Amino acid sequence: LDNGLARTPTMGWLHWERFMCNLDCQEEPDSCISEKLFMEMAELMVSEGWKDAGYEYLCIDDCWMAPQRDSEGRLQADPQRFPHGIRQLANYVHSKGLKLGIYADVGNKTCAGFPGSFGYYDIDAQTFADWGVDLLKFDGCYCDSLENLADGYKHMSLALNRTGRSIVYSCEWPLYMWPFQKPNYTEIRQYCNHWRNFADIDDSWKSIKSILDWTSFNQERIVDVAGPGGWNDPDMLVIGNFGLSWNQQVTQMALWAIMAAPLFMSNDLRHISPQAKALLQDKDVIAINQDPLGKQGYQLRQGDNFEVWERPLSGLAWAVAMINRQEIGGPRSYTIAVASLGKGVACNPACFITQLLPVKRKLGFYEWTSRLRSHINPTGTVLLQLENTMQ
Amino acid sequence: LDNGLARTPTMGWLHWERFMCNLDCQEEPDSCISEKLFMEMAELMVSEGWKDAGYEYLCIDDCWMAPQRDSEGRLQADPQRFPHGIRQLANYVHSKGLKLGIYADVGNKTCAGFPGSFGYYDIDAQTFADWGVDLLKFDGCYCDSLENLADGYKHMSLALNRTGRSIVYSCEWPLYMWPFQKPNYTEIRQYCNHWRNFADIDDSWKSIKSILDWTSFNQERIVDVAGPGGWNDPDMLVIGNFGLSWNQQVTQMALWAIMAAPLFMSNDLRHISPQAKALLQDKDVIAINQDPLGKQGYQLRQGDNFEVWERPLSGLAWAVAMINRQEIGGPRSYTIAVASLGKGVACNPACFITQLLPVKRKLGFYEWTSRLRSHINPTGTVLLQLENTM
Ligand SMILES: *[C@@H]1O[C@H](CO)[C@@H](O[C@@H]2O[C@H](CO)[C@@H](O[C@@H]3O[C@H](CO)[C@@H](O)[C@H](O)[C@@H]3O)[C@H](O)[C@H]2NC(C)=O)[C@H](O)[C@H]1NC(C)=O
Ligand SMILES: *[C@@H]1O[C@H](CO)[C@@H](O[C@@H]2O[C@H](CO)[C@@H](O[C@@H]3O[C@H](CO)[C@@H](O)[C@H](O)[C@@H]3O)[C@H](O)[C@H]2NC(C)=O)[C@H](O)[C@H]1NC(C)=O
Ligand SMILES: *[C@@H]1O[C@H](CO[C@@H]2O[C@@H](C)[C@@H](O)[C@@H](O)[C@@H]2O)[C@@H](O)[C@H](O)[C@H]1NC(C)=O
Ligand SMILES: *[C@@H]1O[C@H](CO)[C@@H](O)[C@H](O)[C@H]1NC(C)=O
Ligand SMILES: *[C@@H]1O[C@H](CO)[C@@H](O)[C@H](O)[C@H]1NC(C)=O
Ligand SMILES: *[C@@H]1O[C@H](CO)[C@@H](O)[C@H](O)[C@H]1NC(C)=O
Ligand SMILES: OC[C@H]1O[C@@H](O)[C@H](O)[C@@H](O)[C@H]1O
């Protein structure tokens, strides 16, 4: 989308994976979708270094709405759970130097069953702008017509544009197309800042794997369309929760960097380990994800339960990720000629290699003819940065 | 098996899951299957408090053997990887106050392709005893008939008894017949100290779930047969490795205690996190696993992606495990009437409840009228001990 936004992949926090549609503020007050949760999350984003690391957007997902629209046909926040409204929540979020994301649906209802935007695209977009919304995640439930789907996503794109407000437009367009036909990604890019391609992530290694496998299987269709202002969205970072081992967390962080993915954490910032925090706030890994060239990476190689991915970076630098997909035994050695990396450019005539994950370690100078030898933990990833050099 | 052994589930370390069949001592001398590897583990079992916690059996799995039997028709350890021989390794292990387990196969070859014991059961049994072996894991590969399988397991059982040496007998009997026939567990128990029921574990949460799910589905057939001298074997503890989250590791530790399972760690004792070590060495949790009553727990309830398992203990105590099987969202509230726990006797008229996992915390007195309220992490388990108040 040519709106001047998402020139690098968007970074922030989104409630969905970790908090979902918890409406029970009486028996689950700490977990329910309330203005208090978003306020408290905003406070920790500032005080715990998240904003400094680049996580700017505090995002509300589904289940913020009142059951019905008001007497004007405008959306309302739930009166019991958001008694002060979205306007004052946005004011609060902006005073902390952060931005506010919200959620709506192209069909007649949201996925959770709250008012949908069909028939209200212009009204809904304007009320978001009036409230001071900075990002919109637009879902695709309760829309069984292919025509309506495309018309809605296109309509809402222009509807937001006409407000004069700078709002990041996050679409689920391609994901809801697959049941009907293969998406036109050139068209989606024209209208969206980023787009969900695949099924919702959950708190599991199974889910990370299925997202990676879908991406690599479909990469010839999606890689080259990504770039400044328009990114593929493989869904939320789920590091800091419950279902991933340390190595599986490393794999997600490393690969979301390779993929030029928007980085939306879905976790609890009030209850997060020092280890998960350090990984999510890793300067060098975030710098890869945020590289100004904006070229999405890809799977270079697969075989023998190993995967090699690489991403071209600015200044003839490259990020290389090696995944060990064997889920038995111990660390396995993998060797590769550096000439095979970065299309033969990264290390011609030499490169300086620095391991970034699982730990940061300078590996030294590698001649074009030389071999890189490494060891990779089961379900883990080794992430390397290659710096082209004459030295 | 009435040999006076495995009166509580066997505890130790077994190389298989973590170290596999690595024969590359040239490129990987620190992780290949060798005498050195077992010496290093033996030292750490003593020095790092594993033996103190109850882990007594240091066990060799497959890939210790030379390609062929010696000139006398006996099994021999690989001459390069085990240069001093097994008898010498057992001498060393014993001097450390530990016990040595080894591995053989009922068929014509082991699963990795080394000499099988079919036709050599009496020689092999006597060889093991002579070496000072304290445990045998007896695999089921390359056995062409169910009759040969049953006969071999019975034969080796009797052959070990005739040596006069106390040797724990670990069988894979039921696992290898399950595809073809329902096992007779009364019969297996008569011959074995513990028995593998289900597919090999690996370093994954998928695997833990499969094992748990198989066990709860088959519990009517397997729970009551277990007891002192004969245990169901759901396979190795894989805590301390790479594929399990903290909460998934807690689930394995807690449920292996509920199941009265043998506790064979398969990990790298040289490279293990303090968190993993503390869990594996948890006194209170080990004590449940090791309860002298030896009554295997069972799944009590299943619904809304929650499972409740319980185990009767000595002196009118019970262990209760609550698993959260939903793999999305956050810590999830579960409640149950305490009157539904422990067959309605655990908390009549009252019980004191202590949470053991994920952390140790006294919950207090619960009347027979009470409800137990808990928040359980996705893929995690809450493990409790109930003491009847009298
Ligand atoms: C509503 O839609 C229009 C049309 O796409 C948007 O205007 C476009 O804005 C972008 C960026 O603001 C302009 O692209 C270029 O910006 C770079 C900045 O580095 C500059 O070097 C180039 O000279 C160029 O201006 C683009 O020209 C412009 N498109 C048109 C046809 O005017 C607009 O931003 C949308 N939303 C809003 C906030 O109104
Ligand atoms: C070979 O097999 C025989 C027979 O199955 C085993 O003998 C059994 O040994 C156990 C434990 O040593 C005996 O149980 C014990 O009985 C005494 C009663 O005097 C009691 O004080 C102990 O608490 C315990 O219950 C069991 O009775 C005995 N069975 C028979 C029928 O004699 C023998 O141990 C096996 N030998 C080896 C080396 O495995
Ligand atoms: C062990 O093997 C015996 C002989 O096996 C025969 O020769 C080998 C090379 C194969 O080709 C096989 O098909 C032949 O039967 C068997 O008599 C015996 O049953 C085997 N024992 C077990 C338990 O598998
Ligand atoms: C929403 O409902 C209207 C009227 O009931 C219907 O005509 C339309 O098909 C629905 N909209 C979408 C986009 O599914
Ligand atoms: C995809 O959509 C774009 C923009 O609407 C258009 O230029 C192109 O023809 C479409 N591609 C195909 C093959 O339909
Ligand atoms: C099971 O095995 C035991 C011991 O061999 C025997 O007493 C019993 O008859 C067997 N039962 C069945 C169902 O075959
Ligand atoms: O999307 C581009 C990529 O396409 C892959 O199929 C190919 O193996 C890579 O070399 C890379 O060029």
mmCIF file of N, CA and C in Angstrom, chain B residues 279-365:
data_model
loop_
_atom_site.group_PDB
_atom_site.id
_atom_site.type_symbol
_atom_site.label_atom_id
_atom_site.label_comp_id
_atom_site.label_asym_id
_atom_site.label_seq_id
_atom_site.Cartn_x
_atom_site.Cartn_y
_atom_site.Cartn_z
ATOM 1 N N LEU B 279 13.916 -30.205 38.472
ATOM 2 C CA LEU B 279 12.671 -30.918 38.200
ATOM 3 C C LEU B 279 12.879 -32.435 38.272
ATOM 4 N N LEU B 280 13.898 -32.925 37.570
ATOM 5 C CA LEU B 280 14.234 -34.356 37.544
ATOM 6 C C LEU B 280 14.631 -34.917 38.912
ATOM 7 N N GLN B 281 15.103 -34.037 39.791
ATOM 8 C CA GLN B 281 15.569 -34.423 41.118
ATOM 9 C C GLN B 281 14.550 -34.074 42.205
ATOM 10 N N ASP B 282 13.365 -33.625 41.787
ATOM 11 C CA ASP B 282 12.320 -33.198 42.725
ATOM 12 C C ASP B 282 11.958 -34.318 43.689
ATOM 13 N N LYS B 283 12.396 -34.178 44.942
ATOM 14 C CA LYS B 283 12.175 -35.188 45.994
ATOM 15 C C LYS B 283 10.725 -35.625 46.149
ATOM 16 N N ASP B 284 9.823 -34.651 46.265
ATOM 17 C CA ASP B 284 8.396 -34.907 46.477
ATOM 18 C C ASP B 284 7.746 -35.612 45.294
ATOM 19 N N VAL B 285 8.146 -35.236 44.084
ATOM 20 C CA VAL B 285 7.626 -35.879 42.881
ATOM 21 C C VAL B 285 8.207 -37.285 42.712
ATOM 22 N N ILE B 286 9.515 -37.430 42.921
ATOM 23 C CA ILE B 286 10.124 -38.757 42.887
ATOM 24 C C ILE B 286 9.430 -39.682 43.901
ATOM 25 N N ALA B 287 9.115 -39.154 45.089
ATOM 26 C CA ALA B 287 8.482 -39.943 46.157
ATOM 27 C C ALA B 287 7.116 -40.501 45.767
ATOM 28 N N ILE B 288 6.357 -39.733 44.990
ATOM 29 C CA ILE B 288 5.103 -40.219 44.434
ATOM 30 C C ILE B 288 5.365 -41.373 43.455
ATOM 31 N N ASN B 289 6.286 -41.162 42.512
ATOM 32 C CA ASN B 289 6.648 -42.200 41.553
ATOM 33 C C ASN B 289 7.043 -43.477 42.285
ATOM 34 N N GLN B 290 7.791 -43.291 43.375
ATOM 35 C CA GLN B 290 8.399 -44.376 44.137
ATOM 36 C C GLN B 290 7.538 -44.906 45.287
ATOM 37 N N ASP B 291 6.306 -44.420 45.407
ATOM 38 C CA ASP B 291 5.412 -44.869 46.472
ATOM 39 C C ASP B 291 5.421 -46.401 46.629
ATOM 40 N N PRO B 292 5.753 -46.899 47.841
ATOM 41 C CA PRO B 292 5.917 -48.346 48.075
ATOM 42 C C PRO B 292 4.680 -49.192 47.761
ATOM 43 N N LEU B 293 3.497 -48.589 47.829
ATOM 44 C CA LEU B 293 2.251 -49.276 47.477
ATOM 45 C C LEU B 293 2.250 -49.743 46.018
ATOM 46 N N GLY B 294 2.918 -48.986 45.149
ATOM 47 C CA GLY B 294 3.077 -49.353 43.742
ATOM 48 C C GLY B 294 1.787 -49.500 42.955
ATOM 49 N N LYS B 295 0.799 -48.669 43.264
ATOM 50 C CA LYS B 295 -0.471 -48.693 42.538
ATOM 51 C C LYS B 295 -0.495 -47.627 41.450
ATOM 52 N N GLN B 296 -0.527 -48.067 40.194
ATOM 53 C CA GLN B 296 -0.509 -47.151 39.052
ATOM 54 C C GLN B 296 -1.746 -46.233 39.022
ATOM 55 N N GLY B 297 -1.520 -44.956 38.724
ATOM 56 C CA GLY B 297 -2.606 -44.005 38.563
ATOM 57 C C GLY B 297 -3.329 -44.208 37.243
ATOM 58 N N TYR B 298 -4.337 -43.384 37.014
ATOM 59 C CA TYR B 298 -5.217 -43.556 35.877
ATOM 60 C C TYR B 298 -5.837 -42.204 35.574
ATOM 61 N N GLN B 299 -6.353 -42.050 34.360
ATOM 62 C CA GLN B 299 -7.131 -40.875 34.005
ATOM 63 C C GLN B 299 -8.510 -40.999 34.636
ATOM 64 N N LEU B 300 -8.889 -39.990 35.416
ATOM 65 C CA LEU B 300 -10.201 -39.918 36.053
ATOM 66 C C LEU B 300 -11.211 -39.211 35.145
ATOM 67 N N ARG B 301 -10.781 -38.111 34.531
ATOM 68 C CA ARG B 301 -11.663 -37.232 33.755
ATOM 69 C C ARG B 301 -10.977 -36.613 32.561
ATOM 70 N N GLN B 302 -11.789 -36.281 31.563
ATOM 71 C CA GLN B 302 -11.349 -35.709 30.300
ATOM 72 C C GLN B 302 -12.515 -34.896 29.705
ATOM 73 N N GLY B 303 -12.251 -33.636 29.368
ATOM 74 C CA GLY B 303 -13.271 -32.750 28.807
ATOM 75 C C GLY B 303 -12.800 -31.308 28.787
ATOM 76 N N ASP B 304 -13.308 -30.531 27.825
ATOM 77 C CA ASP B 304 -12.932 -29.124 27.623
ATOM 78 C C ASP B 304 -11.402 -28.937 27.590
ATOM 79 N N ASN B 305 -10.726 -29.874 26.922
ATOM 80 C CA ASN B 305 -9.261 -29.907 26.830
ATOM 81 C C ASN B 305 -8.523 -29.971 28.173
ATOM 82 N N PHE B 306 -9.178 -30.526 29.191
ATOM 83 C CA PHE B 306 -8.546 -30.797 30.480
ATOM 84 C C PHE B 306 -8.549 -32.298 30.703
ATOM 85 N N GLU B 307 -7.500 -32.791 31.354
ATOM 86 C CA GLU B 307 -7.488 -34.145 31.873
ATOM 87 C C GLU B 307 -7.242 -34.119 33.377
ATOM 88 N N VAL B 308 -7.930 -34.998 34.101
ATOM 89 C CA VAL B 308 -7.626 -35.240 35.513
ATOM 90 C C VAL B 308 -7.175 -36.681 35.671
ATOM 91 N N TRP B 309 -5.975 -36.850 36.218
ATOM 92 C CA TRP B 309 -5.429 -38.151 36.562
ATOM 93 C C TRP B 309 -5.220 -38.185 38.075
ATOM 94 N N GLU B 310 -5.341 -39.373 38.665
ATOM 95 C CA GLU B 310 -5.075 -39.553 40.089
ATOM 96 C C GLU B 310 -4.399 -40.891 40.362
ATOM 97 N N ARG B 311 -3.700 -40.951 41.488
ATOM 98 C CA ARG B 311 -2.992 -42.141 41.909
ATOM 99 C C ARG B 311 -3.152 -42.360 43.424
ATOM 100 N N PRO B 312 -3.603 -43.562 43.836
ATOM 101 C CA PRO B 312 -3.612 -43.869 45.268
ATOM 102 C C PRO B 312 -2.196 -44.106 45.799
ATOM 103 N N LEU B 313 -1.917 -43.569 46.983
ATOM 104 C CA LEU B 313 -0.605 -43.695 47.625
ATOM 105 C C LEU B 313 -0.730 -44.417 48.973
ATOM 106 N N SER B 314 0.410 -44.716 49.602
ATOM 107 C CA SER B 314 0.464 -45.272 50.963
ATOM 108 C C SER B 314 -0.144 -44.316 51.975
ATOM 109 N N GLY B 315 -0.678 -44.874 53.061
ATOM 110 C CA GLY B 315 -1.241 -44.086 54.163
ATOM 111 C C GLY B 315 -2.359 -43.135 53.766
ATOM 112 N N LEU B 316 -3.266 -43.620 52.921
ATOM 113 C CA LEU B 316 -4.492 -42.897 52.555
ATOM 114 C C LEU B 316 -4.276 -41.571 51.815
ATOM 115 N N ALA B 317 -3.079 -41.383 51.262
ATOM 116 C CA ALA B 317 -2.786 -40.214 50.440
ATOM 117 C C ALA B 317 -3.096 -40.487 48.972
ATOM 118 N N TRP B 318 -3.261 -39.409 48.207
ATOM 119 C CA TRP B 318 -3.484 -39.475 46.772
ATOM 120 C C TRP B 318 -2.648 -38.423 46.057
ATOM 121 N N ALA B 319 -2.211 -38.739 44.841
ATOM 122 C CA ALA B 319 -1.636 -37.738 43.953
ATOM 123 C C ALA B 319 -2.669 -37.409 42.871
ATOM 124 N N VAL B 320 -2.796 -36.127 42.537
ATOM 125 C CA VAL B 320 -3.728 -35.680 41.504
ATOM 126 C C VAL B 320 -2.989 -34.795 40.491
ATOM 127 N N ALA B 321 -3.184 -35.085 39.205
ATOM 128 C CA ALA B 321 -2.585 -34.306 38.121
ATOM 129 C C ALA B 321 -3.678 -33.720 37.237
ATOM 130 N N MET B 322 -3.549 -32.438 36.923
ATOM 131 C CA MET B 322 -4.491 -31.770 36.037
ATOM 132 C C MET B 322 -3.715 -31.161 34.875
ATOM 133 N N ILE B 323 -3.966 -31.692 33.677
ATOM 134 C CA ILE B 323 -3.320 -31.255 32.437
ATOM 135 C C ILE B 323 -4.222 -30.297 31.654
ATOM 136 N N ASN B 324 -3.624 -29.233 31.134
ATOM 137 C CA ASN B 324 -4.280 -28.361 30.177
ATOM 138 C C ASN B 324 -3.819 -28.721 28.756
ATOM 139 N N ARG B 325 -4.725 -29.302 27.967
ATOM 140 C CA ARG B 325 -4.402 -29.788 26.618
ATOM 141 C C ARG B 325 -4.684 -28.763 25.510
ATOM 142 N N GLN B 326 -5.290 -27.631 25.875
ATOM 143 C CA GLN B 326 -5.528 -26.537 24.941
ATOM 144 C C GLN B 326 -4.214 -25.802 24.685
ATOM 145 N N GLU B 327 -3.845 -25.681 23.413
ATOM 146 C CA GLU B 327 -2.523 -25.175 23.046
ATOM 147 C C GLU B 327 -2.589 -23.768 22.459
ATOM 148 N N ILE B 328 -3.491 -22.969 23.017
ATOM 149 C CA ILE B 328 -3.665 -21.570 22.649
ATOM 150 C C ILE B 328 -4.140 -20.823 23.903
ATOM 151 N N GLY B 329 -3.921 -19.511 23.950
ATOM 152 C CA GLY B 329 -4.380 -18.701 25.083
ATOM 153 C C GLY B 329 -3.438 -18.749 26.270
ATOM 154 N N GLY B 330 -3.989 -18.549 27.465
ATOM 155 C CA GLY B 330 -3.196 -18.421 28.678
ATOM 156 C C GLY B 330 -3.569 -19.436 29.735
ATOM 157 N N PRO B 331 -3.065 -19.243 30.977
ATOM 158 C CA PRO B 331 -3.408 -20.140 32.084
ATOM 159 C C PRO B 331 -4.923 -20.222 32.205
ATOM 160 N N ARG B 332 -5.438 -21.443 32.290
ATOM 161 C CA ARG B 332 -6.872 -21.665 32.172
ATOM 162 C C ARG B 332 -7.429 -22.268 33.460
ATOM 163 N N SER B 333 -8.511 -21.675 33.953
ATOM 164 C CA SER B 333 -9.152 -22.109 35.188
ATOM 165 C C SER B 333 -9.858 -23.467 35.069
ATOM 166 N N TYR B 334 -9.530 -24.367 35.993
ATOM 167 C CA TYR B 334 -10.234 -25.636 36.135
ATOM 168 C C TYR B 334 -10.633 -25.853 37.596
ATOM 169 N N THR B 335 -11.866 -26.314 37.812
ATOM 170 C CA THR B 335 -12.345 -26.651 39.159
ATOM 171 C C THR B 335 -12.995 -28.038 39.219
ATOM 172 N N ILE B 336 -12.796 -28.718 40.345
ATOM 173 C CA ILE B 336 -13.418 -30.019 40.600
ATOM 174 C C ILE B 336 -13.808 -30.145 42.089
ATOM 175 N N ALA B 337 -14.933 -30.809 42.364
ATOM 176 C CA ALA B 337 -15.318 -31.114 43.739
ATOM 177 C C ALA B 337 -14.321 -32.117 44.313
ATOM 178 N N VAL B 338 -13.812 -31.844 45.514
ATOM 179 C CA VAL B 338 -12.798 -32.721 46.107
ATOM 180 C C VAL B 338 -13.394 -34.085 46.461
ATOM 181 N N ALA B 339 -14.715 -34.112 46.638
ATOM 182 C CA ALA B 339 -15.477 -35.342 46.859
ATOM 183 C C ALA B 339 -15.409 -36.304 45.669
ATOM 184 N N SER B 340 -15.110 -35.770 44.481
ATOM 185 C CA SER B 340 -14.925 -36.569 43.266
ATOM 186 C C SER B 340 -13.512 -37.151 43.164
ATOM 187 N N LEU B 341 -12.621 -36.692 44.038
ATOM 188 C CA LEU B 341 -11.229 -37.118 44.008
ATOM 189 C C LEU B 341 -10.998 -38.299 44.939
ATOM 190 N N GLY B 342 -10.071 -39.166 44.549
ATOM 191 C CA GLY B 342 -9.671 -40.291 45.384
ATOM 192 C C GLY B 342 -10.818 -41.197 45.776
ATOM 193 N N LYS B 343 -11.716 -41.444 44.823
ATOM 194 C CA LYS B 343 -12.883 -42.319 45.005
ATOM 195 C C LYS B 343 -13.842 -41.874 46.106
ATOM 196 N N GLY B 344 -13.772 -40.595 46.465
ATOM 197 C CA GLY B 344 -14.638 -40.047 47.497
ATOM 198 C C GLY B 344 -14.111 -40.258 48.902
ATOM 199 N N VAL B 345 -12.899 -40.799 49.026
ATOM 200 C CA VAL B 345 -12.306 -40.972 50.356
ATOM 201 C C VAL B 345 -11.138 -40.046 50.682
ATOM 202 N N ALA B 346 -10.456 -39.533 49.661
ATOM 203 C CA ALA B 346 -9.284 -38.680 49.884
ATOM 204 C C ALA B 346 -9.577 -37.512 50.833
ATOM 205 N N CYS B 347 -10.733 -36.868 50.656
ATOM 206 C CA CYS B 347 -11.083 -35.672 51.420
ATOM 207 C C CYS B 347 -12.377 -35.793 52.230
ATOM 208 N N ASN B 348 -12.653 -36.999 52.723
ATOM 209 C CA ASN B 348 -13.755 -37.254 53.652
ATOM 210 C C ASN B 348 -13.134 -37.631 54.997
ATOM 211 N N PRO B 349 -13.381 -36.828 56.058
ATOM 212 C CA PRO B 349 -14.187 -35.603 56.091
ATOM 213 C C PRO B 349 -13.461 -34.379 55.536
ATOM 214 N N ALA B 350 -12.139 -34.493 55.391
ATOM 215 C CA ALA B 350 -11.288 -33.397 54.949
ATOM 216 C C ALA B 350 -9.924 -33.899 54.467
ATOM 217 N N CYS B 351 -9.212 -33.037 53.744
ATOM 218 C CA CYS B 351 -7.841 -33.318 53.325
ATOM 219 C C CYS B 351 -6.987 -32.049 53.342
ATOM 220 N N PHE B 352 -5.691 -32.206 53.598
ATOM 221 C CA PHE B 352 -4.753 -31.122 53.339
ATOM 222 C C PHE B 352 -4.163 -31.305 51.948
ATOM 223 N N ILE B 353 -4.177 -30.233 51.157
ATOM 224 C CA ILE B 353 -3.691 -30.284 49.781
ATOM 225 C C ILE B 353 -2.424 -29.450 49.596
ATOM 226 N N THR B 354 -1.423 -30.071 48.982
ATOM 227 C CA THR B 354 -0.158 -29.428 48.676
ATOM 228 C C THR B 354 0.085 -29.533 47.173
ATOM 229 N N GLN B 355 0.258 -28.382 46.528
ATOM 230 C CA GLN B 355 0.697 -28.354 45.147
ATOM 231 C C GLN B 355 2.193 -28.661 45.105
ATOM 232 N N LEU B 356 2.581 -29.565 44.212
ATOM 233 C CA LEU B 356 3.990 -29.890 44.019
ATOM 234 C C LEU B 356 4.564 -29.283 42.741
ATOM 235 N N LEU B 357 3.780 -29.299 41.665
ATOM 236 C CA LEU B 357 4.181 -28.749 40.369
ATOM 237 C C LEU B 357 3.070 -27.857 39.818
ATOM 238 N N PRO B 358 3.419 -26.793 39.061
ATOM 239 C CA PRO B 358 4.761 -26.341 38.634
ATOM 240 C C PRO B 358 5.685 -25.871 39.761
ATOM 241 N N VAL B 359 5.103 -25.368 40.852
ATOM 242 C CA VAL B 359 5.870 -24.997 42.053
ATOM 243 C C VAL B 359 5.241 -25.597 43.309
ATOM 244 N N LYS B 360 6.056 -25.771 44.349
ATOM 245 C CA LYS B 360 5.585 -26.281 45.630
ATOM 246 C C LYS B 360 4.926 -25.195 46.469
ATOM 247 N N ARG B 361 3.681 -25.452 46.853
ATOM 248 C CA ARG B 361 2.861 -24.490 47.574
ATOM 249 C C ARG B 361 1.749 -25.232 48.323
ATOM 250 N N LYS B 362 1.657 -25.014 49.631
ATOM 251 C CA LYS B 362 0.566 -25.563 50.440
ATOM 252 C C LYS B 362 -0.731 -24.839 50.098
ATOM 253 N N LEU B 363 -1.774 -25.601 49.790
ATOM 254 C CA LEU B 363 -3.061 -25.004 49.451
ATOM 255 C C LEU B 363 -4.011 -24.946 50.649
ATOM 256 N N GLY B 364 -3.763 -25.781 51.652
ATOM 257 C CA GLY B 364 -4.547 -25.769 52.883
ATOM 258 C C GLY B 364 -5.579 -26.875 52.987
ATOM 259 N N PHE B 365 -6.455 -26.739 53.979
ATOM 260 C CA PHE B 365 -7.472 -27.739 54.276
ATOM 261 C C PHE B 365 -8.681 -27.611 53.361
#
